[PDB]
Design an enzyme around this catalytic site. Structure first.
Site, mmCIF file in Angstrom:
data_model
loop_
_atom_site.group_PDB
_atom_site.id
_atom_site.type_symbol
_atom_site.label_atom_id
_atom_site.label_comp_id
_atom_site.label_asym_id
_atom_site.label_seq_id
_atom_site.Cartn_x
_atom_site.Cartn_y
_atom_site.Cartn_z
ATOM 1 N N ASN A 10 60.042 -10.311 -60.374
ATOM 2 C CA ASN A 10 59.491 -9.317 -61.276
ATOM 3 C C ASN A 10 60.049 -7.930 -60.902
ATOM 4 O OD1 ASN A 10 58.077 -7.803 -63.157
ATOM 5 N ND2 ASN A 10 56.056 -8.120 -62.259
ATOM 6 N N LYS A 12 59.744 -5.326 -62.595
ATOM 7 C CA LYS A 12 58.861 -4.296 -63.133
ATOM 8 C C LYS A 12 59.714 -3.253 -63.870
ATOM 9 C CE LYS A 12 55.434 -5.389 -59.544
ATOM 10 N NZ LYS A 12 54.363 -4.732 -58.760
ATOM 11 N N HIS A 94 50.080 -9.717 -66.248
ATOM 12 C CA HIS A 94 50.300 -9.068 -64.963
ATOM 13 C C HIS A 94 49.177 -8.057 -64.752
ATOM 14 C CE1 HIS A 94 52.243 -6.905 -61.594
ATOM 15 N NE2 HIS A 94 52.849 -8.069 -61.429
ATOM 16 N N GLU A 166 47.751 -12.932 -58.087
ATOM 17 C CA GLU A 166 47.979 -11.617 -57.513
ATOM 18 C C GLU A 166 46.749 -11.183 -56.706
ATOM 19 O OE1 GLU A 166 49.894 -8.697 -60.124
ATOM 20 O OE2 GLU A 166 49.047 -9.940 -61.660
#
Ligand SMILES: [As]
Ligand SMILES: [As]
Lengths: 244, 244
Positions: A10, A12, A94, A166
């Site tokens: 990821n 981002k 996310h 997460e």
């Protein structure tokens, strides 16, 4: 006995043309001799250059988010547009999008159902805050988030689902990660089915580095990683190697 | 006497590789022999192919949205990333983003200031709903939205600002459009400065087609268009011609 591992990057909201070309070259030269699904999720505008340059046979490209349909949604990217582009993976729910961009449990669950129905592989993200963890609500929260997603899916959709846990509360020991993964798998096993639970990938999405990856993947209910900062670095290759 | 017109395409969340290649080819063959700034705003994932194929000397590429900074903002595209990519235009505060994606007046105003400070040209969108229009609040609302943006800008920033008026209430006659444009210009003239008001582009962003563009651009306070549906079609060329 584990299902196929996944090691997903990821990126981002990070990167330059220069930094991406340098990184993808090193990822392209890395020989991977075991069964692992690698995923790179660039920012939307970087998806084309990544698709163009990435040759490693173990990789698929993923989006970092999407909306269900094309139309009058200024600034958003739809799942039909991604498919036309040749992208068939997407990260959804996310914590950053749950926190900053209005993605409630129901919004996330509907996005996952939409992706499923349009033939995507989905990395669906769940996890509890520090406030939730300190009130003893880890199980309630991750199970309630997973339940919201499961509620919109038929049983056969799960071959297209990957969970990513997460530990928002830390932004964690491998044992704390394992405990949550086990608890997630138990739920899927009892509520959805034993066969589905065995086969489901549950990726760890806390802090993953070359230094801790091998110890994390030793745990029986951890099937790989959703990697943050270290996936912007050649170190990602070593994280891939740690799932041997 | 008018400042340079702008004709901007807002493709919103629409397009295929095939449809974009066919459209850009026709836009590339269109000879434009007057002073006009053309803008195409594709969805983020289409920005690379548009930058690659678009050769028309009157065009710049724009993003449809952005966030201020790079970092841990999964799914978003930052202004630094856009600049590295070679994009120096951005649409901000589109009604769809104000309505669906949490962009209050303050969020929009801060995004505009961030873009200004990172050297972007900004098409900042304002406009009132049908409920607001039927309560006699057109002036109050568009002036309050413009005021929120102006509050974060020094006087010299306005050379980088373009306003786009969206008659949200209609999703309008050219006279109703002119009345709002005049009212916007009056405000900028009295509050910000006479020189700034003369030079500012105020684009009409209601329904624009080849059929109505010329009559709309005849109005003294309309300096071009933010085009929706018709900008996905060869018709866009005729809308450009209408600003002769
Ligand atoms: As290669
Ligand atoms: As050309």
């Amino acid at each position: 006995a584990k299902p196929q591992p996944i090691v997903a990057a990821n990126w981002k909201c990070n990167g330059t043309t220069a930094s991406i070309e340098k990184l993808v070259q090193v990822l392209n030269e890395h020989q991977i001799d075991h069964d692992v699904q690698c995923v790179v999720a660039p920012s939307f505008v970087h998806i084309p250059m990544v698709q163009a340059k990435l040759c490693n046979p173990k990789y698929a490209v993923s989006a970092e988010n999407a909306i269900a349909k094309s139309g009058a949604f200024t600034g958003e990217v739809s799942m039909p547009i991604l498919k036309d582009l040749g992208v068939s993976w997407v990260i959804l729910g996310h914590s950053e999008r749950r926190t900053y961009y209005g993605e409630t449990d129901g919004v996330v669950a509907q996005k996952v159902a939409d992706a499923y129905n349009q033939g995507f592989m989905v990395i669906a993200c769940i996890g509890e805050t520090l406030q939730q963890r300190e009130a003893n609500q880890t199980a309630k929260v991750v199970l309630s988030q997973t339940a919201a997603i499961a509620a919109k899916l038929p049983k056969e959709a799960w071959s297209q689902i990957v969970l990513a846990y997460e530990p928002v509360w830390a932004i964690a020991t491998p044992e704390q990660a394992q405990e949550v993964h086990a608890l997630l798998r138990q739920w899927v096993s009892e509520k959805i089915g034993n066969g589905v639970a065995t086969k489901l990938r549950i990726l760890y999405g806390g802090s993953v580095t070359a230094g801790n990856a091998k110890t994390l993947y030793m745990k029986p209910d951890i099937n790989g990683f959703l990697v943050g900062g270290a996936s912007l670095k050649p170190e990602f290759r070593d994280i891939i190697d740690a799932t041997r």
